[PDB]
Amino acid sequence: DESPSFNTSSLTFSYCDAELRIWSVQEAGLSWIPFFGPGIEGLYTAGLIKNQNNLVCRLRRLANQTAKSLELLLRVTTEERTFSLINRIAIDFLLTRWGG
Amino acid sequence: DESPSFNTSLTFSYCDAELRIWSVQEAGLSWIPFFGPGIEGLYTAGLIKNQNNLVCRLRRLANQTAKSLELLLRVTTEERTFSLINRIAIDFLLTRWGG
Amino acid sequence: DESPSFNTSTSLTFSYCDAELRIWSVQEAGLSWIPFFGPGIEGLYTAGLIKNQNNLVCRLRRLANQTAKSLELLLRVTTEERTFSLINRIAIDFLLTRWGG
Amino acid sequence: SGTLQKTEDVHLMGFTLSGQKVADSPLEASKRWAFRTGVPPKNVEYTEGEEAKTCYNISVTDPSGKSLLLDPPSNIRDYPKCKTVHHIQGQNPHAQGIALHLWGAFFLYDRVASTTMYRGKVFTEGNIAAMIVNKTVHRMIFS
Amino acid sequence: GTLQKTEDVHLMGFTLSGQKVADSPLEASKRWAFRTGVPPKNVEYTEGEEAKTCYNISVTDPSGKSLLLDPPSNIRDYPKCKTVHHIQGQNPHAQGIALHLWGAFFLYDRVASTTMYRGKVFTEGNIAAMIVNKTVHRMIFS
Amino acid sequence: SGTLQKTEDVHLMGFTLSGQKVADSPLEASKRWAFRTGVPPKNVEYTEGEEAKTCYNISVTDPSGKSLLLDPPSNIRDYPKCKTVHHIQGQNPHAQGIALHLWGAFFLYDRVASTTMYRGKVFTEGNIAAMIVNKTVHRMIFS
Amino acid sequence: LEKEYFDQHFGPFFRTEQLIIRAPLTDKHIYQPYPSGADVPFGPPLDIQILHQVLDLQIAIENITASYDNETVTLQDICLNCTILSVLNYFQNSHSVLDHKKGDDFFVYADYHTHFLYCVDPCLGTFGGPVFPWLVLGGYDDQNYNNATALVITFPVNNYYNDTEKLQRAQAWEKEFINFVKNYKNPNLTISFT
Amino acid sequence: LEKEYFDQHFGPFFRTEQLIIRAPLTDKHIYQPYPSGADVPFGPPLDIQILHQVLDLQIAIENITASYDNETVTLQDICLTNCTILSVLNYFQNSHSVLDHKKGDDFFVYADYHTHFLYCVDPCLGTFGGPVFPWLVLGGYDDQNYNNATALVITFPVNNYYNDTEKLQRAQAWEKEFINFVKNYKNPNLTISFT
Amino acid sequence: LEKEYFDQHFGPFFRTEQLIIRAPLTDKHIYQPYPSGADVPFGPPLDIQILHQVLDLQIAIENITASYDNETVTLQDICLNCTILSVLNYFQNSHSVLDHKKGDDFFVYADYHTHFLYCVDPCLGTFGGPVFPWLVLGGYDDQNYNNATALVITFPVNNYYNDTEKLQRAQAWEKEFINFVKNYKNPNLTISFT
Numbered sequence A: 001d002e003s004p005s006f007n008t009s010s011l012t013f014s015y016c017d018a019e020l021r022i023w024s025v026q027e028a029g030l031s032w033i034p035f036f037g038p039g040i041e042g043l044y045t046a047g048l049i050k051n052q053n054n055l056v057c058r059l060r061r062l063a064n065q066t067a068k069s070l071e072l073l074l075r076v077t078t079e080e081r082t083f084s085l086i087n088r089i090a091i092d093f094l095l096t097r098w099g100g
Numbered sequence B: 001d002e003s004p005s006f007n008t009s010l011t012f013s014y015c016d017a018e019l020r021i022w023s024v025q026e027a028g029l030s031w032i033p034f035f036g037p038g039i040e041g042l043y044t045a046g047l048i049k050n051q052n053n054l055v056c057r058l059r060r061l062a063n064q065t066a067k068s069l070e071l072l073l074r075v076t077t078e079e080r081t082f083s084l085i086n087r088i089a090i091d092f093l094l095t096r097w098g099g
Numbered sequence C: 001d002e003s004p005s006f007n008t009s010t011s012l013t014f015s016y017c018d019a020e021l022r023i024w025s026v027q028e029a030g031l032s033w034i035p036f037f038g039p040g041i042e043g044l045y046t047a048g049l050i051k052n053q054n055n056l057v058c059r060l061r062r063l064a065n066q067t068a069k070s071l072e073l074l075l076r077v078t079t080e081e082r083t084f085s086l087i088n089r090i091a092i093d094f095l096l097t098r099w100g101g
Numbered sequence D, F: 001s002g003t004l005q006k007t008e009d010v011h012l013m014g015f016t017l018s019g020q021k022v023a024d025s026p027l028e029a030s031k032r033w034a035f036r037t038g039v040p041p042k043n044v045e046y047t048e049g050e051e052a053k054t055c056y057n058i059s060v061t062d063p064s065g066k067s068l069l070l071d072p073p074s075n076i077r078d079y080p081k082c083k084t085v086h087h088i089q090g091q092n093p094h095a096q097g098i099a100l101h102l103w104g105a106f107f108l109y110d111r112v113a114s115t116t117m118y119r120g121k122v123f124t125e126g127n128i129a130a131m132i133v134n135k136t137v138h139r140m141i142f143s
Numbered sequence E: 001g002t003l004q005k006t007e008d009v010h011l012m013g014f015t016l017s018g019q020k021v022a023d024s025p026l027e028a029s030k031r032w033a034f035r036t037g038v039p040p041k042n043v044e045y046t047e048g049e050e051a052k053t054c055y056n057i058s059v060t061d062p063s064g065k066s067l068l069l070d071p072p073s074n075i076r077d078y079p080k081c082k083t084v085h086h087i088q089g090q091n092p093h094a095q096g097i098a099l100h101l102w103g104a105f106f107l108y109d110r111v112a113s114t115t116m117y118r119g120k121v122f123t124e125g126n127i128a129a130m131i132v133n134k135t136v137h138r139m140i141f142s
Numbered sequence G, I: 001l002e003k004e005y006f007d008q009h010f011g012p013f014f015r016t017e018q019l020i021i022r023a024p025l026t027d028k029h030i031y032q033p034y035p036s037g038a039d040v041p042f043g044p045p046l047d048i049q050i051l052h053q054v055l056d057l058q059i060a061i062e063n064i065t066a067s068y069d070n071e072t073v074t075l076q077d078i079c080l081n082c083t084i085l086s087v088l089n090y091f092q093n094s095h096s097v098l099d100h101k102k103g104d105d106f107f108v109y110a111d112y113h114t115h116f117l118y119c120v121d122p123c124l125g126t127f128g129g130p131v132f133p134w135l136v137l138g139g140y141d142d143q144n145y146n147n148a149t150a151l152v153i154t155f156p157v158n159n160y161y162n163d164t165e166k167l168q169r170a171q172a173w174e175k176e177f178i179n180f181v182k183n184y185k186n187p188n189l190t191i192s193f194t
Numbered sequence H: 001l002e003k004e005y006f007d008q009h010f011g012p013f014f015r016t017e018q019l020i021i022r023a024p025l026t027d028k029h030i031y032q033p034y035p036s037g038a039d040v041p042f043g044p045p046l047d048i049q050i051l052h053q054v055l056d057l058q059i060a061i062e063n064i065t066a067s068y069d070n071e072t073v074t075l076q077d078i079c080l081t082n083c084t085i086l087s088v089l090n091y092f093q094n095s096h097s098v099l100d101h102k103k104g105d106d107f108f109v110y111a112d113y114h115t116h117f118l119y120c121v122d123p124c125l126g127t128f129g130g131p132v133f134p135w136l137v138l139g140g141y142d143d144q145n146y147n148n149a150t151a152l153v154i155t156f157p158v159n160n161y162y163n164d165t166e167k168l169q170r171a172q173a174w175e176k177e178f179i180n181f182v183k184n185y186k187n188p189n190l191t192i193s194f195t
């Protein structure tokens, strides 16, 4: 599963519709308490991603690129609960960054 | 999830004086599960001396952690036990590049 | 638990008994990735030929039962029961003990 | 490259199949699904994602009546936002095992994508994508 | 800021009892409430403080069912308590899952919980992430 | 030194006692196990490894009839390859808690090993060894 | 003591109507004290949203006035602030007192501990007449009247046998009441005669 | 509408044999259309298997012929070439492919056993060139619903041969073994009997 | 069967005392052979816990003696160790043999059936006389001789009709037994006479 890095400076990338309507987890002062939180229903916030410099178009093509390797990865694991690849990518990123 | 790093007159870097706790025990055949102490006998009692004002700043970190860890637990979807030991290890390596 | 680097010479250079070693392994055809056209759960095992040409199997069996000294202590401490994969931990401990300053 | 600062900088959206102009009609979407016995079900977690134009709430039953889709895990919920919800219903008389996709697309649910279909609740087709963005870049792209 | 091996970091649980926060059986049920719409979550920890006051509260609805979550086999009782308080109460109108107002966590056997588990001993406190090696540990532990 | 490129390069092979000239005969292969209360059961995942000469399908029951061994999780399956599947049916009246190994060896199952033994299905005794190989060195020796 | 207080309401001058109402569909109700103690269970009609409806209807008994003759006559001027002998008068027939959730968050310290078992905030009657709490509750084992399932409502009505001027106001007062109970729309409580 | 049609078109004209088919061990059958629709439950004797079981009864009739004289007489010779068959099977023209003429993709069967059955309660025309009705075959139905029964009625119209006794003996001795065959039929799922 | 086989023993040769020991609440017990085999079910009175209390019962039966006049009262001098017809006599009425688990940890290779029908590792009676497995198992099914449900205990005692020295001893042998059977406290065992 390839992972690009969209960073500004030049809106360049590293390693299709323009209407990208998404939902996201939201990111006075008492909200961090779970009793005074927003709930899981209201946690979702509306958003809109613009494709100003082929950002959506380079990401929709990436979708089926990652379907190849990710299916093989889930085949090997004997654990059928929810698998967090969040640490997997971070650990792999550190291992492949160190060169020479 | 800010974490101090104890070192050494103790040098610290991110009230009740008495601090008595319990801890996981730190012998030939004892490492075999059949020759183990068990659930009840694993805990060892001990005391922490508030030597270099070390207890007092440890307890004021308590409310600072609860601000951040509630938000972390809200995002995650798994209801099972969540082990933060790996995340603190990865975050320490990730943020080490600055210094 | 300890783990050696089972790497090449640059022979078979090592790092930190029966010669015959029958193993079963998971493989490391155009439509193989999709699980509908995959092997399954009983047919992804491949047989193996291992040569004990550099005193190879003998020490790993001796090393396997030095591992149970410390792996049993780790499993006793942890409170989770279903599955505890160390594949992440060995990777982090590799990085933790490498960037020593 | 080396733009990772802290763990939840990495994001995982599942872009739906409507982008490639793949027919999401209640007639052609069922053509990309099939059955197989002998494979394990697996789950994967994703952070955020696109809301689908059309979503499906399909409860396939055998001629006996049991839902061929698996019992959902407790961490599996309904899909957040859907413009259209299609309640396609029907039966399969010969197939067995667990429901699987053909093209390779994952079935998207509430922050957890799956390789199988779960019992009688809203999902959508898609594939999850990994990337690394910080708050400065994400602020100017979110809206 | 040094770290050598994964088992160096500890998650200590410091209790509200030593913070001169009222742990009496009359002033301790004022910091808890209920809500419908939030999911229960758990967090493990390595070691914890001894508790002056512990509670074994089993709160039931007027029909009789306990509003507290069913404890997993993972979660066990708090190891050592100076005093165990067996308070019993009932919610007339409250519903959902039990939560905490100040932000503190219900502490159990090496796994802290955001929510409350039925008929079994807990103490209130937070989790402190902190790093100690072996040499500093014996210099501090007893 | 030691090199490591990607995470899956580590594999944990469980080397069995059968090839170590440890007596696997059913007369004296049941004296390395015992019972104890108060010890939590734990599991550990491994990638590949040797399969032994002999394998065991033992159904230990109390005098009432209940199996003294733990119910297997869905994660646990039968051990794939076994040259001989030895079937011993043992019964004891003075058990306590869960079954444990005297030598500290682990009960090996399908890619997940355990410190305890599970209900009425094939296992083998062995110990897990972890090590690191890349693509070219493993392919040279695995062949 | 038993028959000592009952002699003042069996007199010929008082024609008292007795009705017994219960909640059959309600389930068991248990209560346990704040510190600790025995889980003393309540009756099926002793719960929330089952005594409110009784309290709602008893207020509407005098709230709704029937157009009789050419003048408006209230029950207060013909009854002999009419005296109410029930369990509802222990809460002064008020919504706030009957749901006086004194306490805090998580669980409430007291809801009926200071209202019902306190005589076992004011607990005595506010109309100046003390009443024994075992009269309102019937169908209970031994002496323990706090473990029953029946509610009794007592409305003292003067006979007015020697006073025909005020007789007509009270004679037809209960004629609509007996018509009301058979025509009362309710899903939970049933009115019974004796 | 119960005996009116049977007494005017297939009355005392052809000497036919009527037998009933029962399926006790088979469970209940339901159907829901591929487009979002109503659950229409069917009876025991139909599902996805016993459909083939009743499909094999007629094909095992012409192959085995009674030893009469030196000629071979099958069901084709005794009828009035395609013959008149009245059952559920004539809706599929008494052929295997039409009964399993599945239409759909790998995940849904859009139309498996209602292209010919429920469509006319691919044409569903009978193999003998006559009109078909969903009520002549399904017995045990309730009220006006014809497709909510529990039994299948199969009848074989055979010419009376009153004016020609040469073909009457061909139509007389074929079922003498068949009436012995139905009581001795090896059938672990389907049960057949007279009335 | 026992009536026909013991019919010839009813003559003037020996006098036997028959008692029946039955296990009311003990669950069904099965034994499976160590290598492999069929699970042979035993009778209720054949579980580690029970039968030992019978061994204790037998010990208490034999050790208690009733003193008569100034003479010495012993069981050994009057019994023909002694003539015992039971299952425990295969174990020589000893606690060590009854719990002589000839096995390693985890499971025992053999603990109980290795002295009952193993080599019939002692396999002979403690007295040396003839003994059969169907003489103690009462309720067996045909050719099993071990598939019964109740235990029978038999004490063959000499008639002592011509021996005046032991006549009083034989008279007083069962005088303490006839009231020891109904005063011994046991909630999982029943003793019946004939």
Ligand SMILES: *[C@@H]1O[C@H](CO)[C@@H](O[C@@H]2O[C@H](CO)[C@@H](O[C@@H]3O[C@H](CO[C@H]4O[C@H](CO)[C@@H](O)[C@H](O)[C@@H]4O)[C@@H](O)[C@H](O[C@H]4O[C@H](CO)[C@@H](O)[C@H](O)[C@@H]4O)[C@@H]3O)[C@H](O)[C@H]2NC(C)=O)[C@H](O)[C@H]1NC(C)=O
Residues within 6 Å of the ligand: B059, B060, B061, B062, B063, B064, E019, E030, E031, E102, G104, G105
């Ligand atoms: C870490 O930091 C936290 C704060 O982030 C400290 O913990 C406590 O935090 C709570 C929550 O903010 C504080 O308690 C609150 O204080 C207020 C008191 O208001 C009262 O004012 C007067 C009396 O002074 C009266 O009118 C009346 O009593 C008022 O209540 C209020 O905001 C809150 O009162 C609550 O009362 C009930 C609760 O049942 C509710 O109905 C009300 O709506 C309201 O929420 C509340 O009591 C508290 O002050 C903080 N403690 C301290 C010492 O500052 C931690 O102490 C700090 N340190 C550590 C080591 O954890």
Ligand SMILES: *[C@@H]1O[C@H](CO)[C@@H](O[C@@H]2O[C@H](CO)[C@@H](O[C@@H]3O[C@H](CO[C@H]4O[C@H](CO)[C@@H](O)[C@H](O)[C@@H]4O)[C@@H](O)[C@H](O[C@H]4O[C@H](CO)[C@@H](O)[C@H](O)[C@@H]4O)[C@@H]3O)[C@H](O)[C@H]2NC(C)=O)[C@H](O)[C@H]1NC(C)=O
Residues within 6 Å of the ligand: C062, C065, C066, F022, F031, F032, F102, F103, I104, I105
């Ligand atoms: C990796 O692997 C090697 C090879 O397996 C290990 O070496 C073995 O270590 C085990 C550790 O338990 C040894 O097992 C023990 O050895 C002793 C044998 O002494 C007995 O010798 C004879 C035997 O007939 C008798 O005089 C008498 O029984 C002696 O006791 C004993 O300590 C143990 O006996 C136990 O046997 C069983 C349990 O095994 C119990 O029922 C008994 O009660 C008794 O406690 C036991 O057998 C084994 O002998 C070692 N083998 C060899 C070849 O050396 C290494 O330890 C390990 N390598 C590492 C960690 O580096």
Ligand SMILES: *[C@@H]1O[C@H](CO)[C@@H](O[C@@H]2O[C@H](CO)[C@@H](O[C@@H]3O[C@H](CO[C@H]4O[C@H](CO)[C@@H](O)[C@H](O)[C@@H]4O)[C@@H](O)[C@H](O[C@H]4O[C@H](CO)[C@@H](O)[C@H](O)[C@@H]4O)[C@@H]3O)[C@H](O)[C@H]2NC(C)=O)[C@H](O)[C@H]1NC(C)=O
Residues within 6 Å of the ligand: A064, A067, D020, D031, D102, D103, D104, D105, H105, H106
């Ligand atoms: C990455 O993004 C690309 C581009 O959008 C997608 O590529 C598609 O890949 C699928 C793979 O399944 C292709 O679909 C297959 O195409 C083959 C041809 O089938 C017919 O296709 C053409 C046009 O539709 C017809 O004219 C002609 O009759 C062909 O027969 C076949 O291999 C497949 O059909 C098979 O299954 C059906 C049963 O349903 C039966 O016909 C047969 O069994 C047959 O073998 C299938 O249709 C698809 O064409 C590709 N699209 C494009 C635009 O190239 C990827 O899917 C995407 N990756 C993801 C989402 O994971």
Ligand SMILES: *[C@@H]1O[C@H](CO)[C@@H](O[C@@H]2O[C@H](CO)[C@@H](O[C@@H]3O[C@H](CO[C@H]4O[C@H](CO)[C@@H](O)[C@H](O)[C@@H]4O)[C@@H](O)[C@H](O[C@H]4O[C@H](CO)[C@@H](O)[C@H](O)[C@@H]4O)[C@@H]3O)[C@H](O)[C@H]2NC(C)=O)[C@H](O)[C@H]1NC(C)=O
Residues within 6 Å of the ligand: G037, G038, G039, G040, G041, G042, G147
């Ligand atoms: C009419 O009245 C009868 C008789 O009173 C009611 O039936 C019983 O009512 C009594 C109270 O009068 C109840 O008895 C109390 O029950 C509690 C025990 O229940 C606990 O059980 C286990 C504990 O192991 C746990 O599930 C849980 O903790 C339960 O709470 C205790 O509160 C009481 O015993 C304890 O308190 C006393 C207080 O003085 C002390 O001595 C000790 O601490 C003691 O341990 C007490 O026993 C009883 O539960 C009622 N029984 C039933 C079956 O409900 C009738 O219910 C009532 N009739 C109707 C129709 O409602």
Ligand SMILES: *[C@@H]1O[C@H](CO)[C@@H](O[C@@H]2O[C@H](CO)[C@@H](O[C@@H]3O[C@H](CO[C@H]4O[C@H](CO)[C@@H](O)[C@H](O)[C@@H]4O)[C@@H](O)[C@H](O[C@H]4O[C@H](CO)[C@@H](O)[C@H](O)[C@@H]4O)[C@@H]3O)[C@H](O)[C@H]2NC(C)=O)[C@H](O)[C@H]1NC(C)=O
Residues within 6 Å of the ligand: D059, H037, H038, H039, H040, H041, H042, H043, H142, H145, H148
């Ligand atoms: C003999 O008699 C009749 C037919 O002649 C049969 O009765 C039919 O049986 C079904 C099932 O009981 C009747 O009920 C229908 O079931 C469906 C329920 O909708 C939900 O179904 C499941 C519930 O878990 C959900 O998964 C699903 O998403 C749906 O939400 C619906 O199809 C029907 O509801 C609609 O029916 C009609 C639609 O035309 C409307 O008029 C209604 O208002 C409603 O919207 C319905 O409830 C069904 O009605 C019956 N069919 C008829 C009358 O034609 C008997 O069972 C049969 N007897 C035997 C022994 O086979």
Ligand SMILES: *[C@@H]1O[C@H](CO)[C@@H](O[C@@H]2O[C@H](CO)[C@@H](O[C@@H]3O[C@H](CO[C@H]4O[C@H](CO)[C@@H](O)[C@H](O)[C@@H]4O)[C@@H](O)[C@H](O[C@H]4O[C@H](CO)[C@@H](O)[C@H](O)[C@@H]4O)[C@@H]3O)[C@H](O)[C@H]2NC(C)=O)[C@H](O)[C@H]1NC(C)=O
Residues within 6 Å of the ligand: F059, F089, I037, I038, I039, I040, I041, I042, I141, I144, I147
């Ligand atoms: C009075 O009469 C007889 C004795 O004379 C007793 O009958 C015995 O009862 C058992 C059942 O309780 C008979 O059946 C045996 O049960 C076992 C079943 O096999 C599996 O059982 C469970 C399944 O979950 C597994 O745990 C277990 O490992 C086995 O896989 C087996 O022990 C036997 O199977 C064998 O049967 C014959 C035996 O020769 C072989 O041909 C087979 O291949 C197989 O190995 C068996 O089925 C048992 O046979 C009976 N014993 C006999 C006849 O001697 C009555 O119960 C008893 N009555 C009372 C009240 O006690």
Ligand SMILES: *[C@@H]1O[C@H](CO)[C@@H](O[C@@H]2O[C@H](CO)[C@@H](O[C@@H]3O[C@H](CO)[C@@H](O)[C@H](O)[C@@H]3O)[C@H](O)[C@H]2NC(C)=O)[C@H](O)[C@H]1NC(C)=O
Residues within 6 Å of the ligand: D057, D059, D078, D085, D120, D121, D122
């Ligand atoms: C997707 O389709 C499924 C199947 O029809 C829908 O599930 C249905 O959800 C409703 C509530 O929305 C359930 O009703 C409730 O069920 C239980 C008792 O069964 C109880 O909580 C309530 O009294 C209420 O009746 C209904 O049972 C359930 N149906 C099935 C078959 O499980 C689902 O809602 C659909 N999703 C959407 C977004 O519409």
Ligand SMILES: *[C@@H]1O[C@H](CO)[C@@H](O[C@@H]2O[C@H](CO)[C@@H](O[C@@H]3O[C@H](CO)[C@@H](O)[C@H](O)[C@@H]3O)[C@H](O)[C@H]2NC(C)=O)[C@H](O)[C@H]1NC(C)=O
Residues within 6 Å of the ligand: E056, E058, E084, E118, E119, E120, E121
């Ligand atoms: C805190 O209070 C709770 C609730 O009363 C206690 O938990 C309960 O403890 C009792 C007594 O041990 C358990 O009863 C059990 O019942 C059967 C026999 O009836 C048997 O399993 C045991 O012998 C035991 O008696 C009960 O199950 C248990 N309930 C739960 C939900 O765990 C708890 O013990 C109290 N804590 C302390 C520290 O006292």
Ligand SMILES: *[C@@H]1O[C@H](CO)[C@@H](O[C@@H]2O[C@H](CO)[C@@H](O[C@@H]3O[C@H](CO)[C@@H](O)[C@H](O)[C@@H]3O)[C@H](O)[C@H]2NC(C)=O)[C@H](O)[C@H]1NC(C)=O
Residues within 6 Å of the ligand: F057, F059, F085, F120, F121, F122
């Ligand atoms: C190891 O021994 C165990 C028994 O100790 C064997 O498990 C047995 O597996 C068979 C199938 O191979 C099970 O039969 C099935 O049972 C149910 C109920 O009938 C049903 O799913 C099937 O119709 C079938 O009959 C059997 O119940 C099961 N035994 C137990 C006690 O669970 C296992 O197969 C052995 N491993 C081998 C031979 O490799």
